[PDB]
Amino acid sequence: SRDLQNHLLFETATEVANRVGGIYSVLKSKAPITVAQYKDHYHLIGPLNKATYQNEVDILDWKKPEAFSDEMRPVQHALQTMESRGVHFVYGRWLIEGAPKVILFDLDSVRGYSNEWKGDLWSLVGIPSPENDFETNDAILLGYTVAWFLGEVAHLDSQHAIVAHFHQWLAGVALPLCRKRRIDVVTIFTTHATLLGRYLCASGSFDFYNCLESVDVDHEAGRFGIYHRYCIERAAAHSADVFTTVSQITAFEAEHLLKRKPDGILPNGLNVIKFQAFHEFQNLHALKKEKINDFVRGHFHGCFDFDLDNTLYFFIAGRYEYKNKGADMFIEALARLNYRLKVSGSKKTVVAFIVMPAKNNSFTVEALKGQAEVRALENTVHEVTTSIGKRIFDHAIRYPHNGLTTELPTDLGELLKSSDKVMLKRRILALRRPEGQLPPIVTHNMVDDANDLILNKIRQVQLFNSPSDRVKMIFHPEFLNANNPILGLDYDEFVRGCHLGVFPSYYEPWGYTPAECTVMGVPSITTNVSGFGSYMEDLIETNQAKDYGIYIVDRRFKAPDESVEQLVDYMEEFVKKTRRQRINQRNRTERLSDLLDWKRMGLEYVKARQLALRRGYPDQFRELVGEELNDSNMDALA
Amino acid sequence: VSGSKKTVVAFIVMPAKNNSFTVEALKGQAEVRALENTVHEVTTSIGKRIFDHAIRYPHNGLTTELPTDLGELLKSSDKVMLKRRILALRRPEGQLPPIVTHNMVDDANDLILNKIRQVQL
Amino acid sequence: VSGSKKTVVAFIVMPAKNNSFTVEALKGQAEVRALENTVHEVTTSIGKRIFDHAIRYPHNGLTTELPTDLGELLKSSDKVMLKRRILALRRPEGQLPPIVTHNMVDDANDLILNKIRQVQLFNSPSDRVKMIFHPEFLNANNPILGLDYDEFVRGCHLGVFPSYYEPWGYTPAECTVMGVPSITTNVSGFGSYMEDLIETNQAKDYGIYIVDRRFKAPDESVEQLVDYMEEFVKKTRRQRIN
C-alpha cells in the first residue's frame, strides 16, 4: 500500500557535485521547477568531489531532528545506517536557484569494497572492469553505494513510492542492481549520447546514420577498448523500468546501439529569465553589436571599404570538433555564398566568426596594434570635435554681430583648423597597412598553424578577406570573455550582437549551442541530426519554422553536397532580408524561446515518472485514474 | 641601503633592430584601458545614488546628508565586473615587468640588454 | 484610503495671461543642476581612488580587491561641497512645492487656480496626487522644461481630456499615435469615432478610456473618470508597457 501521489524522487548523476560537461547545467537549470513540485521529497545524489564541493554546496547537519520532516525521517534513518557501516557523505544545499537537497558520497570511504563489488557485478551482469579505468571504478563504487542507499530507504519508508532517476552510464551501475535485488523503487534511465555513437563518428569516415542498423555492437565496442563501458550503458538501458534519451535522433541511435527502443524523450530545457519589457533584448542586440563593430573596425583597419550598417554577423561556436560540429560545411558553404553574393551585385557583407578553442600562443601583435590605432583615432577625433564645438558655440552666441551674416558657420575652414588636420592625418597614417596585406583570417598565433583543420579549409577555399569578397572570415581560437582585450564581450553578449548562428552539426545528441542562441532571440541554422533540430522539426512544420528563425538542414536523407547547397540557400535567404524583416524575425524567434523553458520541458520529466509508477504499481495506478491507460509509451499515457 | 621610498623608472630610447611591440606590452595597456572604462561605468552608478540621497534628504528615513556606508553606493553587480578587471591585470607567479617593450631581432647579442642583465636590474 | 504607494504628478498645460516663470522655478532648476555638477566632480575623484586601489591590489597593504570603507573614497573636501549644494535646495519650514510655474496676471480670479485651491491639492507630503499648473504651451526653448509638446506627451503615462465640447480633439488622438493611453469622452468627435470601432471593454485595453458625459449626471461622470484613473494607477510596469 504505497502512495503514488505523495512519492519521493532521487535523481542521480556524476555531475551533481561538480561541472564536467553539459549535464551539470541541465540538473542546475532544471532544479527550480523540480523543487517547486517536490520540495523536500527531492534529493540529488552524486559522488563527492573533495576539491570543489565547498564552493557549491552548503553543508548541513543531517543528524539534527529539524533537518528532516516527520514523513522524511526514513531518509535520515537511511543515512544513519550508511554512516553505521563507515560510509562517509555530505548532505547539504546545492547553492543554486531552487536550492535543492544534495547527498554526495565519499567514494574513498568505500574504495575497500572494490575487489568484491567488481567480482559481484561480473557474476551478476557480466560486466568486466580493467583496473586502470578510474572512471568505471568510480561508476561501480557509486552504483553499489546508491543501490545500497536506495535499498535502505525502501526498507524504512512504507509511506511513499520511490522514483530513482539515473543520468548517463557513469551513473548507471545501480540499475542492474536494483532490478536483480528486486528493491521496491521504480527506476528511470536517461542517456545524453551513446558510447558507440561518439566513437563510430570520431574518425569522420563512417556513414553513421545509414549504417548503424548493421553494426555489430559487441565487435565495435571491443574494437574501441570500450567493451566494459558499453556493458554498463546497455545494462542501465535494459534494467530500468523507463528508458529515455534527450532527443528523437539519439532515440534512433539508441534503439540500434543499445537494443531497446526508448519509451520517450526528455529534451533539455533552459531556465529562461524574461525581461520586464519584451523589447529589451532588441536594445541589447544593438549595444552588443556596436562592440562587435568596434572589433571589426580595428581588424579591417586600412581595408575598411564596406558599410557596417549593411553588414551581417554569422557565427559558429563550440568545441573544436571539425567534422561533428560541421565547421567543414560552414566554411564550404560560406565560400559558395561569397560566390552567389558577388554574382548578384549585392552591397551587403557577411563577417563570419568561428569560436572554437585551439592550442594557441595568445593574440597576434597585429590584432592588438589595430585595436589601439583605432582607439587613438577615436581620441583624436574627440579632441577635435571639442574645438569645433567651441567655434560653433562662439559663432552662435555672437550672431549677428562683428560681420557674422549667417546664423551658422558655412565654411569648414572656420571650424576645422590646420593643427587639427595634422593630427587627424597622422592617426590615419597609423592605420594604413602595407601594399597587398589583407586582414588576417585569425586573431591568434597558433601552436600548430600548418596542420590546423579549420585554417586549412579557409585557405583551401581561399576566403582571404580581400576587398572583392562579400564574405569575410575570422577565426578566434579561444572562448569569448569580457576580459578579451580585442573583443571584450562574454559569449552570451556576443551572441546577442550577432545576426545568425550557423551550426551544421553531424553528431550532436542535444544542441545547447542553437538552443541558447534561440533563447537570446537570434535565428540559427541547425541540422536534422542534431537533437535540437530534430526536436524543433517535430514541433513546427519545416516551412513555418524559417519564420521563427529556425533553419533546419537535412543531413539525414540528402547527399553531403545537397546538404551544403541547402545550407547556402538558407544563408542566402537570410542575407536578402531587410532590417525590418530581420527585426520582426528576431521577435518571432524570441517568442519561440518559451518552448525551451523548463516550465514546458519539465512536463516531459513528469510524463517519464508518471510512466515509471504506472509500470511499477499497475494495480494501484489504475485505482487512482479510473480505468487502465496505455503504458507502451510516455506519450500513449498522457 | 638608505631605505629610500622613492622610485626611479629609467628609460632608454635608442633605435635597435626589432620586430615591433611585444604582445605583453600591448595586452597590458589594453587591460589597464579596460579597467578605466569599467571604473567609469561604476562611478556613473555611484553618482546616480549619491545624487538621489542628496536630493531626498531628510525624507524617507534618511538621517544623514550624505551616504555613510559603501554598500549604499557600490552594488554586487559593480563589484563583480571590477573584480574581473582586476583578475585580468594579474600576472603569473614570479613573472617580472619586462626590461624591454619590443621583440628584438638579436636580443642575445644586443649590447644594452647584455648590460642590464649583467647588473641584474 | 487604499494606502497605495504610487504618486501621480498631474500637469495642466493651458495658456493663461502671465508675467513669465517665477524666480522660484528658475532657481529650482539651477540649484539642482549645480548639485548634478558637484556630484560629477566627486565621482571623478572617487574614480581615481577606485582605480588606484584596483591597480595596486594586493600590494602596499591592500589586502582586499576593492575598497570597503567609504572614507577611502569620499574625502572631507568632497563632503563639504556636497553639503553646500544640499543646503541650497533646502526650502524654509512649512513651504510647499508650488501649484504653478509662472507669475499670473490675475492670480486671484483664475479659474484653474481657484479650483485647485477649492479642492485643496497643495502638494503636501501626504497628498498622493501632486499638481503643477503650467500656463504656457510647451516649447523646447522653455528654460524650465526643455521639451516640445510632442516630446512631453511621449514622456507621460496618461493624457486626460474630459471635454464637453470637442468637435474632434487632436489632443487625445496625438496621444494614441504616440502610444500614450488617453481618457476622452463620448461627446468628442474622436471619442465617438473610436467608440464605433472598438467595443468599450476592449477599448480600455487599447488605451482608449471613454467617459460617458452624455447619459450620466455630471457626478456619475466624475466618478467613472476616477475609476479609470485608479484602475490605471493599479497597473504594473509590465502592464503599462504592453
Ligand SMILES: O=c1ccn([C@@H]2O[C@H](COP(=O)(O)OP(=O)(O)O)[C@@H](O)[C@H]2O)c(=O)[nH]1
Ligand atoms: O566562447 C564560448 C563559446 C561557447 N561557450 C559555451 O560552451 C558550450 C559549447 O557547447 P558544445 O559544443 O560543447 O556542445 P553543443 O553546443 O554541441 O551542445 C555552449 O553551451 C556555450 O554556452 C562558451 O561558454 N564560450
Ligand SMILES: O=P(O)(O)OC[C@H]1O[C@H](O)[C@H](O)[C@@H](O)[C@@H]1O
Ligand atoms: O542589426 P540589425 O538586424 O540591422 O537590427 C538593428 C536594430 O536592432 C534593434 O532592433 C534596435 O533596437 C534597433 O534600433 C536597430 O535598428
Ligand SMILES: OC[C@H]1O[C@H](O)[C@H](O)[C@@H](O)[C@@H]1O
Ligand atoms: O478639427 C480641428 C479642431 O477644430 C476645432 O478647433 C475643435 O475645437 C477641435 O476639437 C478640433 O480638433
